[PDB]
Structure 1
Amino acid sequence: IIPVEEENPDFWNREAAEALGAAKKLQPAQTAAKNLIIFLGDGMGVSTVTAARILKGQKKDKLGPEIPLAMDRFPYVALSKTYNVDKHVPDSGATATAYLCGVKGNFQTIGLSAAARFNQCNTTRGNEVISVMNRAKKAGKSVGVVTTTRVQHASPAGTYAHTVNRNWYSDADVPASARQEGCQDIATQLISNMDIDVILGGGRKYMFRMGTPDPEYPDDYSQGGTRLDGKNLVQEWLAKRQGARYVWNRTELMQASLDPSVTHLMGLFEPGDMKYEIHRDSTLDPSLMEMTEAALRLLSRNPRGFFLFVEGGRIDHGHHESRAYRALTETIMFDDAIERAGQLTSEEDTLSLVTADHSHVFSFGGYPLRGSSIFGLAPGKARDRKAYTVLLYGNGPGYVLKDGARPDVTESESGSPEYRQQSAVPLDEETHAGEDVAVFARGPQAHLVHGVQEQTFIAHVMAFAACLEPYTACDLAPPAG
């Protein structure tokens, strides 16, 4: 469909003149950031952003691509080079080292320099690189980790953990030799490495001893505690702090977030990862946006400010499944959380960055008409005389042959939340992609986020903005306010 307003050049000329006006009004701050927020869309590459924008646009009144995402409104954009030291196409652990600790690492390690080696516990020590969240805490800020994955998953773990193996969620996962060598499982590291004021996401099971029924699924033994060492890490965490609260459901979370006596909050909402938003039980489980608000309620009390990590963690998971519907709906909820955090904080004193750890082999093509569903069919048949979707994957589990042939696909099929877009190469999981991802920034010193930068720049600009180590001699005036 051609929107009539857009047929007049004046429409475009007015928009551009307004854009030039806004561009000209941008001024760099002379002042530091009181607060830091990093919003991490796991797997949210450029193609994901555009596709999500179109989907979000259409979910409102709109044709799609002309409607800004909340992230699109951020004034400063850079490209971020995501390669890990050892792999061009990276994983979440080693990218987390980059954007949270400011140093690049090796694939499937977390919080370690690239002197360490995956799955070799004895290469850990001396290679620990401290996150900006950790430095924020040291400087007296409150700190929070919020994600739709396990809070022990690679991205959130980057804020607090140092491990040669991102798969070491609980002690059950750690080989005996590594346990003897003192490489702590991530769940332990979560409660032990540093004080974290707010921890919200999945990963209940890693905190409890084998045999402990999950509070939510007490009749599914597979969801129970995993720990071999008999520890209840939740109780240990609570015991260390007056005003600490543990919650496992939404209503308790909301209650805790409004309770002035709650100074530390651990909310673990599923045994493993949280459900996709489309599957979320809204009585039992908070959305990402809700977890972010709950976090901000607590974190905002500290006069020294806060550092908050918010992850749209299952964007990534949707793409691995080659289910763009899941990737893109997770992206929208991620963007909704960005929007919500922007309502609850001030860009005068809050530096907010939105980025992705890496992308995926997700493409948006064919030549679909304006306003057509992102989950629809490309116009025109393929050379094998069957239909194809506008969304495709380079590889992944959407690759199919029914009786020697690529299957035809209908619109009703392609639009299903379970539909797997086709790919060139069958893999159980679609792969990450290595192309640059966007960094969006607003707030004090956001203007430093520019050009094409290494992914480590994300961590460094945040430290610098808040005058955290190694930039305590930042040359900045106190935060506005």
Structure 2
Amino acid sequence: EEDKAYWNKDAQDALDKQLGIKLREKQAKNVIFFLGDGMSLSTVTAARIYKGGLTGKFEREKISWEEFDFAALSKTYNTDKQVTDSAASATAYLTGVKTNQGVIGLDANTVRTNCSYQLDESLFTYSIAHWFQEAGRSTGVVTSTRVTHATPAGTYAHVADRDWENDSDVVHDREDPEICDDIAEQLVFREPGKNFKVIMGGGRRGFFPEEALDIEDGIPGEREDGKHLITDWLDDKASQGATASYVWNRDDLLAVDIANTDYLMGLFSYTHLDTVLTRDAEMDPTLPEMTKVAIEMLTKDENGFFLLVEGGRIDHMHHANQIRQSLAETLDMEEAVSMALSMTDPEETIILVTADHGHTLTITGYADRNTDILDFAGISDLDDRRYTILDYGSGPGYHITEDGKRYEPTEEDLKDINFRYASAAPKHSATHDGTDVGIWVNGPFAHLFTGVYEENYIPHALAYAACVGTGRTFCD
């Protein structure tokens, strides 16, 4: 039982672990970057307890990346807003430069929704994936979102508005698609996108025209310019004399011949991949499964590789105050981190986990230990109605009943994967949260992450340790 001796040994052991930390002052060969979108520190705590609910450890459970010796805090404000969107943050943590809301791979001179700015190369910021490529090393990206979503896009795109995932989105904002390249285009026609060995996620819709029909579902595509970008991608690999594979389902992914495959594009949905609690496990590969295949491919490169893996729908669930699903997405990513750790060598591989920004999730009192984190906390002493442990500062969960009272959540509500937990400030989609987020790191030079940093510091430190880019380097 958790008595005085128990806690003293628990602590003495942690101290013993801390004292035994051996620094790794050697170049990083590989860098695996995990990004939990909208994964606030509160999401991590809540998810630790959620996991504990499955394993029976409850509040004593540990999140995989919390076994790392190095954690840090990251300040996420951007050049025009206190609370960053996913685009400006991705530009910061992948290109090393902070920027305006809605802009990817361009600096703060950029005026959002203005394409001219994406024609000016002097305004370009370049990603750690670019840098790995310039050094002759392999790159890839896995995500549960559309592969043209802001996060993956930060590794390769330069656009004046994150909304421009395909040419139909450019036209929608009155811009000229002929000269304003959309993100899907940039992934297949430009560097570094065109050189990625592995591209996985969703978003097939931005890659083929309205006149064409989707693999799997037969839904017409979104492109309005007649371009079939997947076949463009395939033709490109083939004309280089390389083998390439396009897959769109789990069985096919797992059947891929790793040894004989140079390029891999796996697009498992028309749009974002289905959430953990709604996906067809037969048809959709999980985040860890995608991660495994990505690592299998990229590790063939003896000079090293960079891989971005995003737990992306964490954010989407928070936006709808759908906290149960948000926690399930989070754990899918926690499991992916474990998959990566078991497949790589920490003496040469940096594994970093962070968030782009948080969400306004809070953990209220006062439930007893071992209480399911999604359960009720107690009854309000002001209106006599139940309240949940988890709730939000912002979102559509705020609900005044027909009688003008605070909606009281039910047992049925709590079990419902679509139930929206209460918020303090009603909004159709919850805003992001501005609080500093966490960073957790293992491997070479993990001790570059000890304190509190601006969010754009991250890739500068990672470059130093991997010896890529044009800044200070360990090999320097």
TM exceeding 0.5: yes
Look up the equivalent residue of 1:374 and give its one-letter code: I
SS of the residue 1:278 aligns to: coil
Q: Distance in 1 between matches of 2:325 and 2:433?
A: 18
SS of the residue 1:326 aligns to: helix
Look up the equivalent residue of 1:189 and give its one-letter code: Q
Structure-2 residue corresponding to 1:129: 125
Give unpaired runs (5+ residues) of structure 1: 477-481
- Tell me, yes or no, if structure 1 residue 56 matches structure 2 residue 51: yes
Structure-1 residue corresponding to 2:469: 469
Q: Distance in 2 between matches of 1:174 and 1:67?
A: 46
The alpha carbon displacement at 1:405 in A equals 1.3
- Tell me, yes or no, if structure 1 residue 69 matches structure 2 residue 63: yes
Moved more, 394-403 or 33-42: 394-403
User: Is the Cα–Cα contact under 8 Å of residues 121 and 181 in structure 1 kept in the other structure?
Assistant: no
The alpha carbon displacement at 1:177 in A equals 5.6
The alpha carbon displacement at 1:109 in A equals 0.8
Q: Distance in 2 between matches of 1:414 and 1:177?
A: 44
Q: Distance in 2 between matches of 1:306 and 1:48?
A: 29
Look up the equivalent residue of 1:431 and give its one-letter code: T
User: Is the Cα–Cα contact under 8 Å of residues 200 and 265 in structure 2 kept in the other structure?
Assistant: yes
Give runs of aligned pairs for residues 453-468 of structure 1, distance below 5 A: 453-468=453-468
> How big is each residue's C-alpha offset from its partner over 1:171-197, in whole Å with a ceiling of 9 and x where there is no partner?
011038633672210000111222111
Give runs of aligned pairs for residues 392-403 of structure 1, distance below 5 A: 392-403=391-402
SS of the residue 2:255 aligns to: helix
Change in 2 beyond 3 A, CA 1:473/1:390: closer
User: Is the Cα–Cα contact under 8 Å of residues 363 and 393 in structure 1 kept in the other structure?
Assistant: yes
> How big is each residue's C-alpha offset from its partner over 1:266-300, in whole Å with a ceiling of 9 and x where there is no partner?
00000110000111111111011111001011011
- Tell me, yes or no, if structure 1 residue 95 matches structure 2 residue 84: no
Give runs of aligned pairs for residues 93-242 of structure 1, distance below 5 A: 93-124=87-118, 125=120, 126-175=122-171, 178-179=175-176, 182-193=179-190, 194=192, 195-218=195-218, 221=219, 224-241=220-237, 242=242
Structure-1 residue corresponding to 2:376: 377
- Tell me, yes or no, if structure 1 residue 40 matches structure 2 residue 39: no
SS of the residue 2:175 aligns to: helix
1:31 to 26, 29, 52: 26
Q: Distance in 2 between matches of 1:415 and 1:48?
A: 19
- Tell me, yes or no, if structure 1 residue 278 matches structure 2 residue 277: yes
Structure-2 residue corresponding to 1:479: none
SS of the residue 1:65 aligns to: helix
Change in 2 beyond 3 A, CA 1:180/1:68: closer
Look up the equivalent residue of 1:137 and give its one-letter code: Q
SS of the residue 1:441 aligns to: strand
Structure-1 residue corresponding to 2:267: 268
User: Is the Cα–Cα contact under 8 Å of residues 258 and 296 in structure 2 kept in the other structure?
Assistant: no
Q: Distance in 2 between matches of 1:322 and 1:59?
A: 22
Give unpaired runs (5+ residues) of structure 2: none
SS of the residue 1:388 aligns to: strand
The alpha carbon displacement at 1:366 in A equals 2.4
SS of the residue 1:240 aligns to: helix
> How big is each residue's C-alpha offset from its partner over 1:355-386, in whole Å with a ceiling of 9 and x where there is no partner?
00000111111211101011111123341111
SS of the residue 2:223 aligns to: coil
The alpha carbon displacement at 1:474 in A equals 2.1
Percent of aligned pairs sharing the same letter: 43
The alpha carbon displacement at 1:315 in A equals 0.3
The alpha carbon displacement at 1:68 in A equals 0.7
The alpha carbon displacement at 1:313 in A equals 0.2
Moved more, 224-233 or 429-438: 224-233
Q: Distance in 1 between matches of 2:379 and 2:400?
A: 20
Look up the equivalent residue of 2:263 and give its one-letter code: H
Q: Distance in 2 between matches of 1:473 and 1:274?
A: 38
TM-score (norm 2): 0.95
The alpha carbon displacement at 1:233 in A equals 0.5
Q: How many residues align?
A: 465
TM-score (norm 1): 0.94
SS of the residue 1:335 aligns to: helix
The alpha carbon displacement at 1:85 in A equals 0.9
Q: Distance in 2 between matches of 1:473 and 1:396?
A: 43
User: Is the Cα–Cα contact under 8 Å of residues 395 and 430 in structure 2 kept in the other structure?
Assistant: yes
| Alignment RMSD | 1.3
Structure-1 residue corresponding to 2:429: 429
Give runs of aligned pairs for residues 311-460 of structure 1, distance below 5 A: 311-403=310-402, 404-460=404-460
User: Is the Cα–Cα contact under 8 Å of residues 376 and 415 in structure 1 kept in the other structure?
Assistant: no
User: Is the Cα–Cα contact under 8 Å of residues 122 and 181 in structure 1 kept in the other structure?
Assistant: no
The alpha carbon displacement at 1:475 in A equals 4.0
> How big is each residue's C-alpha offset from its partner over 1:139-175, in whole Å with a ceiling of 9 and x where there is no partner?
1111110000000000000000011110001101103
Q: Distance in 2 between matches of 1:192 and 1:101?
A: 20
SS of the residue 2:246 aligns to: strand
User: Is the Cα–Cα contact under 8 Å of residues 74 and 455 in structure 2 kept in the other structure?
Assistant: yes
Q: Distance in 2 between matches of 1:355 and 1:265?
A: 26
User: Is the Cα–Cα contact under 8 Å of residues 35 and 310 in structure 2 kept in the other structure?
Assistant: yes
Moved more, 258-267 or 431-440: 258-267
Q: Distance in 1 between matches of 2:175 and 2:409?
A: 49
> How big is each residue's C-alpha offset from its partner over 1:405-426, in whole Å with a ceiling of 9 and x where there is no partner?
1121223322321211011222
Q: Distance in 1 between matches of 2:420 and 2:183?
A: 32
Q: Distance in 2 between matches of 1:416 and 1:369?
A: 23
The alpha carbon displacement at 1:98 in A equals 0.6
Moved more, 25-34 or 78-87: 25-34
> How big is each residue's C-alpha offset from its partner over 1:397-443, in whole Å with a ceiling of 9 and x where there is no partner?
11112211112122332232121101122211111000000000010
Q: Distance in 2 between matches of 1:251 and 1:475?
A: 42
